[PDB]
Amino acid sequence: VMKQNYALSLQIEYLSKQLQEISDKLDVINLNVLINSTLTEITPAYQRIKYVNEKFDELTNLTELTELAKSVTKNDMDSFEFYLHTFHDVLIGNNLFGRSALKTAAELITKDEIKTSGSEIGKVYSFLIVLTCLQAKAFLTLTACRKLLGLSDIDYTNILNQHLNDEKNVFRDNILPTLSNKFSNPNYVKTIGSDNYAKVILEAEPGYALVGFEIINDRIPVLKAYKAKLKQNYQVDHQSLSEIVYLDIDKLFCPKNSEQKYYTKSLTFPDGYVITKITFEKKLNNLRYEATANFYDPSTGDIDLNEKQVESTFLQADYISINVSDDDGVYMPLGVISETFLSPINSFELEVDEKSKILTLTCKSYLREYLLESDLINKETSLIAPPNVFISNIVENWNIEADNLEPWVANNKNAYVDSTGGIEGSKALFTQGDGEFSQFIGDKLKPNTDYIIQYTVKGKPAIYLKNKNTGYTMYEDTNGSSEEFQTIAVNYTSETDPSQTHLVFKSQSGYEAWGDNFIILECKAFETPEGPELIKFDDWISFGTTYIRDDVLTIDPSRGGYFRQSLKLDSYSTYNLSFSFSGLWAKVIIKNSHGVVLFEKVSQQSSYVDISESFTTTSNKEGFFIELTGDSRGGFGSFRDFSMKEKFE
Amino acid sequence: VMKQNYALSLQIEYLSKQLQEISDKLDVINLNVLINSTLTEITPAYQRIKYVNEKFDELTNLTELTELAKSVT
């Protein structure tokens, strides 16, 4: 009876879940009904405005254009001004039942199952900007039509400004203090990393601050991070934009075969602070990150270095583990992880879900304050869209889209530019025979620095990165007879102060070749540190009767003879202690003057039994001991070859 | 057993509350549907009447006013 009652409880819980799903479906249906309510009032005016704007685009064919202008400028019951007024009233909410279209559109955009670019504020503001630009284009079209007909000029600036101000005020007063300023990655992709050290330092200059990140799933993953100055009211300076590129994204967010520990903590900061440094460090299957934020003054716009808070996850014990096998994989973040418009970041987070093995980089932005103080008070605004393409590359005209290609020079007429070739039709460089294209890139080529030589080609290309003089080729592009365009991202490291190196593009003898999208980025990937040497044969403090000979330091049993050497450990680290004892009951204990023992290995009979075990350090680096001691009373100790190096870092 | 039966009764009461909320949401949806039924018939005439009333307000510019009056009449 108890078992069947429990089963009934489970069935009731299932019914409750079904009821919750039904309620969500009802909410969706009601939202769609409100959408229909908006559409049945807004469809014809919007359609006509869009058609008129599309038609009158060439001037901002004479007979039809004049006829259309006369039809639009005609002042009748059903006129273009009438449709503009109806559109404005519908957006404001001056309809029969006093329901505004802006609220319904904001509800539809917010309550959408698909996440595309960022927070709700960005998308709603983008929709409002699209509507306002459509209205402005319609008013400009009407003014141009009136000018073309040679009719009396009517100043439509006043009515257009009134409409835009009313719409912006309605938005700000009604639907602005309801939206959330939280944005996350739009997409997820399976990836298998490596169980090796990977440190990423997304730092910035003292006058700079991070304004967003971007992850692109290519042959080599990237971590494009945007940093720029702040002018006033959290505005991002366009001229100061800069990018940081990393390549170990897969090796950082995914384990190979030996688990990974994720230390999650919402790094929220108080209002007025802007994140200026994000550092990741996966020592050994343990991802821990910290954030550095500096105080920002909206009135002036100075990122002061005197006030600085740090929200670090390095000194916590709680963690989340994700087991990854060959069958499955953890969904690393993939997409443009930033606001719809570049803005300083307030909080950073790394959410981990064990059920689905997904990672989300939820963050926050100061877009609301900038919108309030720059655009919604009838001031002048300037928002920056995220860079969809690399702009830190040292290859001028990376994709051939503009004419008069000066950086690229052709040796002769065999090689030319093919408009049809390349990505869609972006005027790819075509090489057929001995002809080739060249471009000097030694001006921006920093000595002994890493570089990315990602490019896209078709046919039989050859992009040998030679030094012009002496014919020294620093890169090889042998083979590669693939037909369809594909990425050829290959890591590269520059030599010592070359200062003379030009990138050339040519086709191998015989087959032809097409080339486009030549980008050379500046990566700053790090490497595993060698490790410290905490224990050394220089500070072996001895007590009692001790006999140190060569490197065979002995321990005297049954008396006070014992060695000791304090060492500086870390909070969370792993150390490999290698030694070789040769004494009866000879042990190397690690005390902390409190009874806590971190390592204990005792010899049994004799001989130098080499032991290379490892131990952790818990969460207290108050200073430990490497004391050599023998609890026996007979055979003297004999310890040789001491070494304790931290694992990886 | 008595305690778990009481818990089941509480869960059933919660389900009844959820059903009542669902019924209220259905009533709201039906009201919105009737609102759409009214709007799909009343929107254009109301919009045009409001626009005409807003336009002819100064008299209760001669050329456009006369053209609009001819169009209306």
Numbering used by the authors:
A (entry chain A): 126 to 185, 209 to 797
B (entry chain B): 126 to 185, 209 to 221
Article sentences:
Here we identified Vip3Cb1 and Vip3Cc1, the first Vip3 proteins with broad lepidopteran activity discovered outside of Bt from Paenibacillus strains in the P. popilliae-containing clade, most closely linked to P. dendritiformis. Vip3 proteins, including Vip3Cb1 and Vip3Cc1, are highly conserved in Domains (D) I and II involved in pore formation, with divergence in DIII, IV, and V known to be involved in receptor binding to the gut of the insect host. Vip3Cb1 protoxin and trypsin-processed Vip3Cb1 toxin structures were determined using Cryo-EM, resulting in density maps with an estimated resolution of 2.6 Å and 3.0 Å, respectively.
Artificial trypsin digestion mimics Vip3 activation by serine proteases abundant in lepidopteran midgut. The Vip3Cb1 N-terminus has the signature Vip3A signal peptide “ALPSF” motif. Upon activation with trypsin, cleavage occurs preferentially at Lysine 195; yet, the tetramer stays intact and undergoes large conformational changes, revealing a pore structure as determined by Cryo-EM. The protoxin’s DI and N-terminal DII unfurl and rearrange into an extended 4 α-helical channel (α1act), while domains DIII-DV remain unchanged. In addition, protoxin α4 (residues 165–192) also moves down, becoming part of the newly formed channel α1act. At Pro168, there is a 63o bend in α1act which leads into the long-extended 4α-helical channel. The activated Vip3Cb1 quaternary structure is also like activated structures determined for Vip3Aa16 and Vip3Bc1, with large conformational changes in DI-II forming a long, extended α-helical channel. This magnesium ion was also observed in the Vip3Aa16act structure, similarly coordinated by the Asn (N163) side chain with a similar bond length (3.6 Å), and this Asn residue is highly conserved in Vip3 sequences.
